[PDB]
Amino acid sequence: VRTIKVFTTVDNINLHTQVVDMSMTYGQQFGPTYLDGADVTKIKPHNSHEGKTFYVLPNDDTLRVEAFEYYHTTDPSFLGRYMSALNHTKKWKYPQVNGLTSIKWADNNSYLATALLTLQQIELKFNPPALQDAYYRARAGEAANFCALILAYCNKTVGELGDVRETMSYLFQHANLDSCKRVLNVVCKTCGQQQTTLKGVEAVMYMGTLSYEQFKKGVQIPCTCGKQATKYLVQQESPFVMMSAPPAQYELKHGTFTCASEYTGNYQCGHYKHITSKETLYCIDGALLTKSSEYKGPITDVFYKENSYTT
Ligand SMILES: [Cl-]
Ligand SMILES: [Zn+2]
């Protein structure tokens, strides 16, 4: 008999009018239900809920299409994981540090801070509307939805150990890198030379050396014949490149790179910091900021500006 009007949604844009019975839980009426990230499935409607928007899972064809068009995923657990993360990230603080949105440390989130800082320094356009909209808000300082989307797209929960390289790979999958192109040549003194072309995400990421100049000069890799061959960059067309390696002591020189991530710890436990090269070297550690003219530390990922390179 007693009812309120609420709206359900999967994208927080398209609303769906509902009349709910205040004697039944939201779960009994909608399935799993969330109010700005909080799980209200086991709760009965409150007077204050009238007119508010609730997220639900895509449980009919209209919602399935809305959810795919907004998020570009059909993983059945995506919206519940996004909501579970948002209930935490909405409580984080996002200070402006040296002109960039950072994240005050909470919930083991240092890998997310350095990823967020990196994104604001490289040219990248996302494809899912969810990421376009949330990234716009993040740049303005309201990064809770963007951070909870990063967790959901990477299948990481709040508090879980994350890797910056893997996180960036997920975000780049959902970005328009279609025009990026990389040409490599591999030279074996026994077998001869082989050229390879890479496209998209694989054209901007490399694992094995932090140094873009070393990649141009040549890096040693195994050949199937048993000798060590040399791999070198012949041609690059992209607005940035990302060079990654297992953490190692490495010296970062002012003016020779855009930004970098530093990892202190081991394979089970550690902490990330961000280094950015501007008028000097700034080290951003969540809300914390220090400066130096030189920098040495256990670097894992370095980003460089690019446009067009030909050997
Ligand atoms: Cl919706
Ligand atoms: Zn060979």
Curated annotation (Swiss-Prot):
Catalytic residue positions: 110, 271, 285
Catalyzed chemical reaction(s): Thiol-dependent hydrolysis of ester, thioester, amide, peptide and isopeptide bonds formed by the C-terminal Gly of ubiquitin (a 76-residue protein attached to proteins as an intracellular targeting signal)
Outcome (variant: residue 267 to G/T): Reduced inhibition by GRL-0617
Location of the Ubiquitin-like domain: 1-56
Activity modulation notes: Inhibited in vitro by GRL-0617.
Localization (cell): Host endoplasmic reticulum membrane
Positions annotated to bind Zn(2+) 6: 188, 191, 223, 225
Domain Peptidase C16: 70-311
C4-type zinc finger segments: 188-225
Entry membrane topology: Multi-pass membrane protein
LRR repeats: 116-138
Biological function: Responsible for the cleavages located at the N-terminus of the replicase polyprotein. Participates together with nsp4 in the assembly of virally-induced cytoplasmic double-membrane vesicles necessary for viral replication. Antagonizes innate immune induction of type I interferon by blocking the phosphorylation, dimerization and subsequent nuclear translocation of host IRF3. Also prevents host NF-kappa-B signaling. In addition, PL-PRO possesses a deubiquitinating/deISGylating activity and processes both 'Lys-48'- and 'Lys-63'-linked polyubiquitin chains from cellular substrates.
Subunit structure: May form homohexamers. Interacts with N protein.
Protein name: Papain-like protease nsp3
Gene: rep
Residues of the full protein shown: 1565 to 1875 of 7096
